[PDB]
A paper describes a structure:
Here, the aim was to unambiguously identify the binding orientations of fragment hits for SARS-CoV-2 nonstructural protein 1 (nsp1) which contain a combination of sulfur and/or chlorine, bromine and iodine substituents. We chose SARS-CoV-2 nsp1 as a model system because its crystals routinely diffract to high resolution, fragments can easily be soaked in without compromising crystal quality and several hundred data sets are at our disposal. Nine new nsp1-binding fragment analogues containing sulfur and/or halogen substituents were selected for this study. Finally, we demonstrate that the integration of anomalous difference Fourier maps and PanDDA offers a reliable and effective strategy for fitting fragments into challenging electron density with a high degree of confidence.
1E7 and 7G3 share the same ring scaffold, benzothiophene, with a single substituent at distinct positions. For 1E7, an amine is positioned para to the sulfur, while a more flexible acetic acid substituent is located in the meta position to the sulfur in 7G3, which may explain the missing density for this substituent. Overall, the anomalous sulfur signal from the cysteine, methionine and sulfur-containing fragment analogues (1E7, 7G3, 6A6, 11A7, 11A7_AL5 and 11A7_AL6) cannot be observed consistently, probably due to the low anomalous contribution to the structure factor f′′ (0.2 e) of sulfur at 12.8 keV, which is far from the sulfur absorption edge.
Numbering used by the authors: 9 to 126
The structure:
Amino acid sequence: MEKTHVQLSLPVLQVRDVLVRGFGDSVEEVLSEARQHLKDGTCGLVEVEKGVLPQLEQPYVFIKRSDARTAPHGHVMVELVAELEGIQYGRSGETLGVLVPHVGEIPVAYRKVLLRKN
Ligand SMILES: Nc1ccc2sccc2c1
């Protein structure tokens, strides 16, 4: 049925190219839509630099590194943590980026992850 982890290659997008700048309007919604878009292959990743977060829509969904030992074929193990008004629901490791819908924008790279589905 549903393995706990799935290997994915996510398109990395520059923030100014992103057309849909968040997944929804609550913490529960953004996590739910992030997971659906991951399942459908319509999820992109924006790497965080200065000025990136203010250009995206809260609540944010981050992918964070969940394990230090495991990266099969560079698929870094990650889990999802959401943020609303400065509070994060969950705790994990280093932030690898912020997830956004992908609607056909051209990426600058692909990031390989081993995603904890829940
Ligand atoms: N195949 C696939 C890819 C990503 C995700 S996220 C939750 C379920 C799921 C399934």
